[PDB]
Design an enzyme around this catalytic site. Structure first.
Site, PDB file in Angstrom:
ATOM      1  N   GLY D  20       7.496   1.762  18.020  1.00 35.94           N
ATOM      2  CA  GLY D  20       7.682   1.738  16.463  1.00 35.94           C
ATOM      3  C   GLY D  20       6.426   0.832  15.952  1.00 35.94           C
ATOM      4  N   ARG D  24       1.244  -1.781  18.787  1.00 34.11           N
ATOM      5  CA  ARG D  24       1.563  -1.753  20.303  1.00 34.11           C
ATOM      6  C   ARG D  24       0.897  -0.326  20.639  1.00 34.11           C
ATOM      7  NH1 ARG D  24       7.700  -0.613  21.954  1.00 34.11           N
ATOM      8  NH2 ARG D  24       7.921  -2.939  21.663  1.00 34.11           N
ATOM      9  N   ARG D  43      -1.677   4.468   6.209  1.00 30.73           N
ATOM     10  CA  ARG D  43      -0.663   3.595   6.012  1.00 30.73           C
ATOM     11  C   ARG D  43      -0.599   2.636   6.995  1.00 30.73           C
ATOM     12  NH1 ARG D  43       3.766   4.726   2.361  1.00 30.73           N
ATOM     13  NH2 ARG D  43       3.365   6.496   1.091  1.00 30.73           N
ATOM     14  N   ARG D  87       9.691   8.495  22.718  1.00 29.08           N
ATOM     15  CA  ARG D  87       9.732   7.250  21.989  1.00 29.08           C
ATOM     16  C   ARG D  87       9.795   6.206  23.223  1.00 29.08           C
ATOM     17  NH1 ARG D  87      11.465   2.755  19.257  1.00 29.08           N
ATOM     18  NH2 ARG D  87      13.249   2.036  19.733  1.00 29.08           N
ATOM     19  N   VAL D  88       8.895   5.131  22.896  1.00 31.12           N
ATOM     20  CA  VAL D  88       9.026   3.921  24.073  1.00 31.12           C
ATOM     21  C   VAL D  88       9.108   2.885  23.169  1.00 31.12           C
ATOM     22  CG1 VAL D  88       7.517   5.184  25.642  1.00 31.12           C
ATOM     23  CG2 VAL D  88       6.288   4.162  23.718  1.00 31.12           C
ATOM     24  N   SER D  90      11.933  -0.723  22.107  1.00 32.03           N
ATOM     25  CA  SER D  90      13.104  -2.011  22.535  1.00 32.03           C
ATOM     26  C   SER D  90      14.434  -1.641  21.994  1.00 32.03           C
ATOM     27  CB  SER D  90      12.372  -3.341  21.922  1.00 32.03           C
ATOM     28  OG  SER D  90      12.354  -3.248  20.598  1.00 32.03           O
ATOM     29  N   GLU D 179      19.395   0.604  18.992  1.00 34.26           N
ATOM     30  CA  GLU D 179      18.043   0.692  18.326  1.00 34.26           C
ATOM     31  C   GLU D 179      18.065   1.183  17.081  1.00 34.26           C
ATOM     32  OE1 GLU D 179      18.206   4.267  18.497  1.00 34.26           O
ATOM     33  OE2 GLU D 179      16.011   4.439  19.172  1.00 34.26           O
ATOM     34  N   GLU D 181      16.198   4.654  16.060  1.00 34.13           N
ATOM     35  CA  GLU D 181      15.449   5.893  15.994  1.00 34.13           C
ATOM     36  C   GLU D 181      15.973   7.060  16.478  1.00 34.13           C
ATOM     37  OE1 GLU D 181      13.678   2.827  16.874  1.00 34.13           O
ATOM     38  OE2 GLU D 181      12.827   2.344  14.812  1.00 34.13           O
ATOM     39  N   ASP D 204      16.566  -8.124  23.806  1.00 35.85           N
ATOM     40  CA  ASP D 204      17.532  -9.223  23.503  1.00 35.85           C
ATOM     41  C   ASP D 204      18.796  -8.610  23.755  1.00 35.85           C
ATOM     42  OD1 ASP D 204      16.762  -7.552  20.733  1.00 35.85           O
ATOM     43  OD2 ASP D 204      18.922  -8.844  20.607  1.00 35.85           O
ATOM     44  N   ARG D 217       7.744  -9.901  29.234  1.00 34.28           N
ATOM     45  CA  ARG D 217       7.506  -8.809  28.109  1.00 34.28           C
ATOM     46  C   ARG D 217       6.560  -7.737  28.261  1.00 34.28           C
ATOM     47  NH1 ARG D 217       6.260 -10.435  21.751  1.00 34.28           N
ATOM     48  NH2 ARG D 217       4.225 -11.027  22.696  1.00 34.28           N
TER      49      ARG D 217
HETATM   50  N1  LIG Z   1      19.581  -5.889  17.719  1.00 31.88           N
HETATM   51  C1  LIG Z   1      18.749  -4.602  17.116  1.00 31.88           C
HETATM   52  N2  LIG Z   1      19.400  -3.982  16.386  1.00 31.88           N
HETATM   53  C2  LIG Z   1      18.430  -3.038  15.999  1.00 31.88           C
HETATM   54  N3  LIG Z   1      17.459  -2.451  16.254  1.00 31.88           N
HETATM   55  C3  LIG Z   1      16.853  -3.451  17.259  1.00 31.88           C
HETATM   56  C4  LIG Z   1      17.597  -4.528  17.929  1.00 31.88           C
HETATM   57  N4  LIG Z   1      16.742  -5.150  18.733  1.00 31.88           N
HETATM   58  C5  LIG Z   1      15.694  -4.277  18.867  1.00 31.88           C
HETATM   59  N5  LIG Z   1      15.497  -3.470  17.992  1.00 31.88           N
HETATM   60  C6  LIG Z   1      14.366  -2.614  18.029  1.00 31.88           C
HETATM   61  O1  LIG Z   1      13.071  -2.973  17.303  1.00 31.88           O
HETATM   62  C7  LIG Z   1      13.022  -2.818  15.809  1.00 31.88           C
HETATM   63  C8  LIG Z   1      13.338  -3.581  14.955  1.00 31.88           C
HETATM   64  O2  LIG Z   1      13.220  -4.858  15.236  1.00 31.88           O
HETATM   65  C9  LIG Z   1      14.045  -1.490  16.052  1.00 31.88           C
HETATM   66  O3  LIG Z   1      13.086  -0.243  15.634  1.00 31.88           O
HETATM   67  C10 LIG Z   1      14.471  -1.148  17.297  1.00 31.88           C
HETATM   68  O4  LIG Z   1      15.556  -0.658  17.498  1.00 31.88           O
HETATM   69  N1  LIG Z   2       9.630  13.687  -2.748  1.00 24.66           N
HETATM   70  C1  LIG Z   2       9.628  12.760  -2.176  1.00 24.66           C
HETATM   71  N2  LIG Z   2      10.650  12.491  -1.333  1.00 24.66           N
HETATM   72  C2  LIG Z   2      10.654  11.152  -0.641  1.00 24.66           C
HETATM   73  N3  LIG Z   2       9.983  10.134  -0.762  1.00 24.66           N
HETATM   74  C3  LIG Z   2       8.970  10.289  -1.667  1.00 24.66           C
HETATM   75  C4  LIG Z   2       8.768  11.677  -2.206  1.00 24.66           C
HETATM   76  N4  LIG Z   2       7.878  11.525  -3.175  1.00 24.66           N
HETATM   77  C5  LIG Z   2       7.051  10.243  -3.060  1.00 24.66           C
HETATM   78  N5  LIG Z   2       7.844   9.764  -1.907  1.00 24.66           N
HETATM   79  C6  LIG Z   2       7.295   7.973  -1.712  1.00 24.66           C
HETATM   80  O1  LIG Z   2       6.368   7.927  -0.815  1.00 24.66           O
HETATM   81  C7  LIG Z   2       6.838   7.649   0.624  1.00 24.66           C
HETATM   82  C8  LIG Z   2       6.777   8.997   1.454  1.00 24.66           C
HETATM   83  O2  LIG Z   2       5.912   9.601   1.105  1.00 24.66           O
HETATM   84  C9  LIG Z   2       8.218   7.369   0.229  1.00 24.66           C
HETATM   85  O3  LIG Z   2       8.175   5.902   0.596  1.00 24.66           O
HETATM   86  C10 LIG Z   2       8.324   7.205  -1.295  1.00 24.66           C
HETATM   87  O4  LIG Z   2       9.657   7.619  -1.708  1.00 24.66           O
END
Ligand SMILES: Nc1ncnc2c1ncn2[C@@H]1O[C@H](CO)[C@@H](O)[C@@H]1O
Ligand SMILES: Nc1ncnc2c1ncn2[C@@H]1O[C@H](CO)[C@@H](O)[C@@H]1O
Ligand SMILES: Nc1ncnc2c1ncn2[C@@H]1O[C@H](CO)[C@@H](O)[C@@H]1O
Ligand SMILES: Nc1ncnc2c1ncn2[C@@H]1O[C@H](CO)[C@@H](O)[C@@H]1O
Ligand SMILES: Nc1ncnc2c1ncn2[C@@H]1O[C@H](CO)[C@@H](O)[C@@H]1O
Ligand SMILES: Nc1ncnc2c1ncn2[C@@H]1O[C@H](CO)[C@@H](O)[C@@H]1O
EC number: 2.4.2.1
Lengths: 237, 237, 237, 237, 237, 237
Positions: D20, D24, D43, D87-88, D90, D179, D181, D204, D217
């Site tokens: 994510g 990393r 971005r 996907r790798v 946490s 997680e 995703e 965690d 870690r």
């Molecule tokens: N308790 C939790 N709930 C949801 N996501 C969790 C998490 N602990 C770690 N994650 C992992 O890291 C990202 C957000 O910190 C998330 O992208 C990813 O799932």
């Molecule tokens: N047609 C569309 N559908 C969804 N998101 C749209 C968009 N046009 C621009 N966005 C804007 O830029 C980001 C993703 O490109 C998004 O974070 C943000 O919403």
């Protein structure tokens, strides 16, 4: 004895194969098990226990639909010490490249039933099979020289669905076979703490409306059973 | 013949009584019908045809659950000319004032299944019985000196429910009995233009617990069947 | 004494007739009741109580829509000891064989509202009438030489729906008439343990606009009220 | 170049590892890939391509949440010829017997997101990984002497959920890791025709509120990467 | 000329004030409008049109509940050229700092109704007012030395809800007042391209029953109407 | 420090501007803030703090999607004392009369995400901005000679939607622009008692297609930022 099974702890093996048709369960006992004895006949849902190469094994039908198989798998798990359940049934294909009598292994099962939403607070519960059991079945199939696709099945509540368009959606998302039990059995396995797997042989094509014929049915069905029984032996090792 | 019934047009009467257990269908044909012949045995779901006081009548099991009974009722209606289906089964009670051996008639059926929402654009379809059939049964019961309760049934997908809170809910809204098919059968009747009715005897109180089976219980089960059979004759006139 | 009804226990009979149009309440009191007295005026929802052939009866409008009639029926039931509610209104038909001015009795009521799902833990609650009340109405109609159909009504939240396709669905499932209250009233009756019934006259055909004279319309309305009133007396015997 | 990735066909390998955190991804390139060159920085979502034992491989971050990873995986599959996504990341453990820095392989992924319901006509789509990729990862782990549980993950939309009770439900149904995703990536894989797998290391514990510490870690995270990269080599054979 | 309004194009101004209680329409016409004339009487839902400081304005009740007000607002908009609708009513508060007689302006409206989901393909539609109308109201109130809170309202389908827990939720999310129409009116305005606003005065605190004099209540009501009327003139400039 | 932000109380101003792209946050700090220092870089989500005309202001990216921005906004509000969040991004247009480079202000935000239903007992929560912030922005835009449209935005979970029909729907109900965060941020603001606002410039017409980037496009992006910054100053007085 449970509400739907007249038997006592010990009458069933720790592994049970289950076709939807009770008559098919009787056929499996006579054709593959040794010293096979009837252990249940309540509501005509025949169940048998015997041995396969010295391995104690049971086979019992589960009826049609998630509500029916949910009753039987639950009672086996909570009152008869059953640890592994292997559904051995038929399904309909929606993909053009999936042929009749093909063997499919459901690592997952999609569904239009509400049972898992009721269990999972209305969220999406991924109804999956036990990984080791899936791998055992793949290897067994390999050893027998029989092909087998591994993927998603779709457990339908309505055999005669008023939503034909949904089949396009199933096809689009790669559903290998349409049956009526997998998702429910996987939900019960998770809720009551056991392991399960569903294996099916394509008995017909949803589109072409082509269905099982000749003696291909028996050979193919017998291949599915070989895979199931042999997969258990690998599991024991 | 159809996918689940190996018979031909004419083999079934235009009215079919349907218990959930195949063995109960045999018990009914043997006990109440004259000149009864078995007309189906696919998957062991025994069906029979004979006559009651000169009237041609059929009886066949439908298995457990909405998905199961939906298959059989649909095939009967669209392929065998059946016009009326009368389910005759057992249910668990929720209301305290509803005692064991009470005869319940489902004018309507609530459900936790998704089949009717799938049919009705995700809205609320009120699954109901045919009015004349309900009236015929109420009138037959009176002629036999039996007092029947007419109201809502609840058709469940899970016999072994994870919830539990739902029973307080059923009780609060006046549900008379809990079973697993009425809502499905009423949905099929509406979809294919037929008529259906569900009658049940309370087998146990989900409240005070403890079921019923012996002389008095078996007498009540027979009264339900006589009510069903006599209601058909009333309907004919 | 109540948020929407300024009256005291005893001012209303244990049976109340309820039209949607408030103006109809005064018409019914003057045309069919004896010794009528006004018992409510809040928000212009006029209520009256009198007698019909000796029986005490009340009449008051309920307003359009499930939310409105839910308020009035609940208050009458919980604070004025009302035991039976009979809604008398109009509906639109979707079935070809259902003609203008036809009298329809809703044994059940489908709906696109969420009120019953909120009550029934998001499951399907079959909103039904009280069976005896339905039969009383059918017999009262017969005695008046009037034809009456008994089946499902559909209670819409939107008179002007953006989903035109839903009417084809209603037709496919045998819906007799479309209105906007039944399922809500039936839900309230079930919730607070009372009895209810909805009777309607077909005022239009949602597909084939027809025409009626003002006199034919008053005749049909008076016929519906007579059926409702005579049905109460039958229920008393 | 796509709306979120400034690159041309050929810049990415046919297999892409995705954490994510973009930082990393940079760490993985510097630590495991040879002749690693940056292929994207739009971005700040860093992407790299290099070789691992002569095998061309890419690594790029995907951001947090299903909506974010859905954008990146889709663009890679449709405009860059990527065939496998791994996907790798946490996750948080909910089961007492699941320890920190444990390695989990998601054969399936549950979720409270609506994305798959939008794709599957509001029914239950079992979001699963590619079986061969799962087996490759298990074997790779075995060869490295590293343990790894195979099962269901839960992809949450809210890291800070207002429904703490749901964690009891996850635990009850055997969720191995929480997680944000997996379920989405699996949905995209199925919709656009590619293969995917999610591997996570318990960073965690949801309950104990214990989290990653010391240098455990890095070693643990490096073990996950070893499994992923090696699993690809087995896949090529 | 319309199913619920017997009038012709031009009888209503392009701006309409709508109280829930029909009786209030005549009061507003006599108390605030000049040269008023009656324009509707169907079902006793009296409508009037006159002028306020030279501006043409109409006033007519809408009835209780989303279904009722949806009918009237739609007809006014599609058949009488109405451009703006201002609902003026009462509400109950759940927030401690919101006092009895407080003037609340709903920039948005939450709801437990299904009407907007039916319109918005089952997704979340944010039912909002027209921003200029909101600002006009705020400024008109300020000029009248009256305090006004702007935020979310909650439009309930059930005045008597079986879910007591929902009020704690409303409080947690800052809901200013509970009524039964806003979300429905805002939905209609969005559907047929018009503008709407809901203004309410706190008539009670759903937790701490308070007391008000009949005179204090008329004063607050007259204050709300003045705010509504003066806001229209501001919108004209 | 928090799980996703490595900083300490005081490092952020009580008002934060948030673009989706981390690099845009750097562009904003560099272009409009004086004495700006970087206060966070975890996961590359750059955050900065400086002053605008003497006013302490912060700006930090929030990533793409509701799950992403929900994490950052929550941590800011509960751990860094932030009281106002102003999202400044881009959106796709649906309404034909909405041209490129138009400045849109989201008084409300519709969504296909399930987060607000999870928060609001599965009912409809109207995700809205803070009224004073909307008014401040509208007033700042006017002072700059820029005409801003105030209305509904649609926050999507899938940038690459499978549907397509949903865009006709958005257009029909007046949605001004489509983005992916507003609904999530407004939900977080309500849950933790803060204030939020979303402002967007149309980057493309999902209808006439073709985006905008060059001198005129960049000029409009800067106007949006000036509107955001100037609105804060108005709010302070
Ligand atoms: N308790 C939790 N709930 C949801 N996501 C969790 C998490 N602990 C770690 N994650 C992992 O890291 C990202 C957000 O910190 C998330 O992208 C990813 O799932
Ligand atoms: N047609 C569309 N559908 C969804 N998101 C749209 C968009 N046009 C621009 N966005 C804007 O830029 C980001 C993703 O490109 C998004 O974070 C943000 O919403
Ligand atoms: N097209 C189809 N749809 C649903 N189920 C199908 C099927 N073809 C075969 N089946 C299998 O046999 C049983 C019912 O015939 C079911 O239990 C089982 O799924
Ligand atoms: N409490 C209960 N829940 C569900 N089904 C119940 C029941 N009591 C009896 N039944 C009836 O017998 C069958 C299963 O035992 C079902 O087919 C039928 O509904
Ligand atoms: N086609 C139709 N759709 C909905 N309601 C209809 C109707 N025809 C008459 N009604 C009757 O009058 C009221 C609203 O017009 C409703 O209360 C009542 O149902
Ligand atoms: N606590 C409350 N809950 C719901 N509605 C309330 C109310 N207090 C006043 N009302 C107002 O009067 C009508 C119904 O009583 C509704 O139209 C209007 O909202």
């Amino acid at each position: 004895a449970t509400p739907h099974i007249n038997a006592e702890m010990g009458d069933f093996a720790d592994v049970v194969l289950m076709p939807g048709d009770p008559l098919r369960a009787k056929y499996i006992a006579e054709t593959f098990l040794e010293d096979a004895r009837e252990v249940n006949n309540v509501r005509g849902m025949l169940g048998f226990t015997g041995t396969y190469k010295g391995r104690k094994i049971s086979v019992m039908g589960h009826g049609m639909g998630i509500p029916s198989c949910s009753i039987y798998t639950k009672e086996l798990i909570t009152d008869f010490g059953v640890k592994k359940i292997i559904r051995v049934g038929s399904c309909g294909a929606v993909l053009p490249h999936v042929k009749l009598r093909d063997v499919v292994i459901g690592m997952g099962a999609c569904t239009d039933s509400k049972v898992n939403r009721i269990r999972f607070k209305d969220h999406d519960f991924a109804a999956i099979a036990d990984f080791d059991m899936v791998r055992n079945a793949v290897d067994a199939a390999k050893a027998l020289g029989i092909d087998a696709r591994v993927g998603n099945l779709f457990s339908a509540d309505l055999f005669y669905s008023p939503d034909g368009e949904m089949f396009d959606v199933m096809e689009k998302y790669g559903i290998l076979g349409v049956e009526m039990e997998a998702a429910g059995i996987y939900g019960v396995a998770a809720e009551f703490g056991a392991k399960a797997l569903t294996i099916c042989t394509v008995s017909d094509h949803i589109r072409t409306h082509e269905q099982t014929t000749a003696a291909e049915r028996q050979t193919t069905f017998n291949d599915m059973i070989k895979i199931a029984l042999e997969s258990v032996l690998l599991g024991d090792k």
